[PDB]
């Protein structure tokens, strides 16, 4: 669970604002499909029929090993719903562990703003815990089927790199690749095993504290969701963040739609002015009492690229409003090497090998800071 996995290095692909997908073979013979890495859910589902937005899909009748559960599933979303028919079939990850697993699989027969026009992925891989698995906990999540049936350590780390513009990354199943990051991994406790829920103890813009109550950040919860692009903030917190950001960015001429994430802003390729944007810091509950560490992201992170003409660089505000709590999306995970230590119920963060930076500032994971709020920043149970 701690060495060098050169066969999983750089096994992730995707487009900015369209998530990261990994290649998985399903069925017999093996149907090769691109599935999005979603830590914000627990269900493994794939498109079951031809779509306009998809290059391929999962042909159940093509798989002699496929078995129908003759039961359906339906998943409301924020945003992008989907529903389908449940079943089981052999699953394998070509550029990962040399293992085969018979896992649950939801053939998606219908969806709304779920799939993305030409995102080159047809399925979703819910890596979260069964408590949030639809229809209910009885449906064993893929990764749970993985560890229960193989000798893969209960752990997986991600290295989203970024930089529609194409991107790449690494998903280490079972171990920690020590060439994907520098320094150390700062772990924050998984408050509860349903989503990868954590506790944000403090938020800052350009060093300045946001001055909001601790459990305003974790209302009704904070999660680490690779399946979400944006950095979602609860109404109050979002309202304050954008205000503080405006005040410290010299950005009085930007359209208001920009802050709502509807209208883009463009500069000439390579001429983007990062220095006019503040840095955002998010302090997470540490492992030891009273201590906390922070993660610092730059505009290169919370300003994601988006017709879009060759010569221009255009961006949309990768910070949106939420009604179900805080969601630390792909924009928060890119500059870093996030580790999901399921075995020790903790999520580590570290400056990845593909850390984002410029000749002035850089993404950073710094500690230890003191927080007397700690575990009482949560809101529900």
């Amino acid at each position, epitope marked *: 669970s701690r060495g060098s996995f050169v066969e999983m290095v750089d096994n992730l692909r995707g487009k900015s604002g369209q998530g990261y997908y990994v290649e998985m073979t399903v069925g017999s013979p093996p149907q090769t499909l691109n599935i999005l890495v979603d830590t914000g859910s627990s269900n493994f589902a794939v498109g079951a029929a031809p779509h306009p937005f998809l290059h391929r899909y999962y042909q159940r009748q093509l798989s002699s090993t496929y078995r129908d559960l003759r039961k359906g599933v339906y998943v409301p979303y924020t945003q992008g719903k989907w529903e389908g028919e449940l079943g089981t079939d052999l699953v394998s990850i070509p550029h990962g562990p040399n293992v085969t697993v018979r896992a649950n699989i939801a053939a998606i027969t219908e969806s709304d703003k779920f799939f993305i026009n030409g995102s080159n992925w047809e399925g979703i891989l819910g890596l979260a815990y069964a408590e949030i698995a639809r229809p209910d906990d009885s449906l064993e999540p893929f990764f749970d089927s993985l560890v229960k049936q193989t000798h893969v350590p209960n752990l997986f780390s991600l290295q989203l790199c970024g930089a529609l513009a194409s991107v790449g990354g690494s998903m280490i199943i079972g171990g920690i690749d020590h060439s994907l990051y520098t320094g150390s991994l700062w772990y924050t406790p998984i408050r509860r095993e349903w989503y990868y829920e954590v506790i944000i103890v403090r938020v800052e813009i350009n060093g300045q504290d946001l001055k909001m109550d601790c459990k305003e950040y974790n209302y009704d919860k904070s999660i680490v969701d690779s399946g979400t692009t944006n950095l979602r903030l609860p109404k109050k917190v979002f309202e304050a963040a954008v205000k503080s950001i405006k005040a410290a960015s010299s*950005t009085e*001429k930007f*359209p208001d739609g920009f802050w709502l994430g509807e209208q883009l*802003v*463009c500069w*000439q390729a390579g001429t983007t*002015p990062w220095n006019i944007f503040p840095v955002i810091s998010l302090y997470l509950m540490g492992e030891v009492t009273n201590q906390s560490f922070r993660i610092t992201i730059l505009p290169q992170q919370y300003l994601r690229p988006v017709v879009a*003409t060759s010569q221009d660089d255009c961006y949309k505000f990768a910070i949106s409003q939420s009604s179900t709590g805080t969601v630390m999306g792909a924009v928060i995970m890119e500059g870093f090497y996030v580790v999901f230590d399921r075995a020790r119920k903790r999520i580590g963060f570290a400056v990845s090998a593909c850390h984002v930076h410029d000749e002035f500032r850089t993404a950073a994971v710094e500690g230890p800071f003191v927080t007397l709020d700690m575990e009482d920043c949560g809101y529900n149970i």
Partner: antibody
Amino acid sequence: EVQLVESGGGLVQPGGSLRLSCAASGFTFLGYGIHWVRQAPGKGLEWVGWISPAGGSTDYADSVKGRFTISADTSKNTAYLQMNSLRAEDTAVYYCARGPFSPWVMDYWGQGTLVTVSS
Amino acid sequence: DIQMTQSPSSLSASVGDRVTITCRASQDVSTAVAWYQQKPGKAPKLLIYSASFLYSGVPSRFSGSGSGTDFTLTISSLQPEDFATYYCQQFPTYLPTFGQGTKVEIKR
């Protein structure tokens, strides 16, 4: 290919009205703004106005304040400049330039349209 | 209404020389400054933005610097194609005003 094309330039009577256009092409219209700048023959530059086609968000200079009215057609990728009560002092080359919301600079200028107020 | 006094109004240098053009703001304009080039008859092109950041496609021999009121544009190695009139600009309060220009002629 990034390019702006002004129009409407010509002879105008003192106290007359003229309407200049600014055809945008080859770049993401929405995402930038459009400045209007003028320059007399042999003289320097003088920022005339600005607009954000998403959505104005219009800004003028005291010189043209109350006479010039900036318009924008996002359907046609075109910014307009309505000019009224034109005096001789208004004679100048009128450039429209692409403008990043920040910094407030003009990165691509059109070759302009010459306007001459004369009897 | 901020004012921009460039200096000098004109100059003539030889190919290769180090030419420096200075611009003075009538008030602290931080770093909100730009520099344009304009060939006679042609439109102005952006060279430097935010005082010292070159625009995409602008040669390396063009250099900007300064803060507050004293900003300077420098052309380390003058070239024939650098003949033009140069302008500085301010926009900290979003009320842009340019300098009176500086025609740089070539000696041969």
